[PDB]
Amino acid sequence: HNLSPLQQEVLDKYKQLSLDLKALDETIKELNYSQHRQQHSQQETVSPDEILQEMRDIEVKIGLVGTLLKGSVYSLILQRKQEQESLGSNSK
Amino acid sequence: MENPHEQVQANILSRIIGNVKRLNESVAILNQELVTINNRNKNLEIMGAICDNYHSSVQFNLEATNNKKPPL
């Protein structure tokens, strides 16, 4: 099956294009592998160990640092407001 | 003519009145100092209340999740 030279150039360019196509597909997959330390590997690929399993692990205890201070201050303010409303309503 | 005891007792009574006056002055200044110190210290109730609230908060936060570490 003979072909014109331009067609053959188109064809082997298509071949090379398919080659780096599946190359890029493999790269994107390898990023998406949650196989971190499951398959033979020692680098973290974006997966729950970078996400909720990890960030949520941080978050279930970061509240003990940031939101708990507020909560305590708000609780004191709420108790003060309770005392104020009780005294104001009952005194009159 | 008058009994000297009466005069000496009047004198010592005058002294006792003066001493009671001095005691009253001292106690008044003491009350002023106590009022001032309590008024200035009023912030410490705030600080202690918030610290106690935070301590209770972290204690029950370690209770709620199973993240409470074992006693060293």
Side-chain angles (χ1 to χ4, degrees):
Chain A
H1 272 187
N2 71 280
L3 294 170
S4 94
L6 255 66
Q7 292 153 18
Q8 199 59 84
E9 181 272 323
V10 165
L11 265 281
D12 41 11
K13 181 147 196 83
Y14 267 53
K15 295 294 133 299
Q16 176 268 148
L17 169 68
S18 171
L19 298 152
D20 43 0
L21 258 286
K22 332 162 279 303
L24 171 132
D25 177 272
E26 184 39 358
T27 316
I28 269 66
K29 284 206 60 34
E30 191 46 286
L31 252 188
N32 224 67
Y33 284 55
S34 309
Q35 301 285 334
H36 187 19
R37 278 200 173 289
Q38 293 135 70
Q39 83 198 153
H40 148 57
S41 56
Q42 307 179 357
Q43 85 302 331
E44 148 59 1
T45 49
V46 50
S47 54
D49 44 9
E50 190 51 286
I51 327 164
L52 220 72
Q53 171 296 328
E54 178 55 69
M55 286 260 182
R56 214 71 201 191
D57 173 348
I58 281 169
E59 172 264 353
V60 313
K61 66 189 69 159
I62 207 184
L64 175 161
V65 182
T67 207
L68 253 54
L69 271 41
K70 313 211 170 82
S72 94
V73 170
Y74 194 71
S75 96
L76 178 58
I77 288 287
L78 151 73
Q79 207 211 289
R80 189 64 42 79
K81 162 28 54 63
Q82 181 173 36
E83 302 140 28
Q84 288 315 298
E85 55 81 20
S86 58
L87 298 153
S89 63
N90 292 291
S91 194
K92 301 166 192 180
Chain B
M1 299 331 82
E2 63 292 8
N3 284 5
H5 292 277
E6 171 267 359
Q7 206 289 327
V8 86
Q9 297 194 135
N11 202 263
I12 188 189
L13 276 199
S14 98
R15 177 159 72 265
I16 212 164
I17 300 316
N19 207 237
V20 168
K21 230 169 287 281
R22 311 277 143 275
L23 199 53
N24 298 355
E25 161 208 336
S26 63
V27 169
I29 316 302
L30 172 145
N31 293 1
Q32 289 293 339
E33 209 38 17
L34 285 176
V35 163
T36 316
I37 195 188
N38 282 337
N39 293 345
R40 91 153 35 96
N41 276 353
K42 280 199 307 318
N43 295 0
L44 261 53
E45 305 78 315
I46 305 317
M47 281 292 334
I50 83 170
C51 85
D52 199 0
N53 290 9
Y54 178 65
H55 181 85
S56 308
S57 199
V58 316
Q59 287 317 312
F60 182 72
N61 220 288
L62 300 155
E63 306 295 313
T65 168
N66 308 359
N67 210 351
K68 153 163 260 279
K69 293 289 145 300
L72 185 152

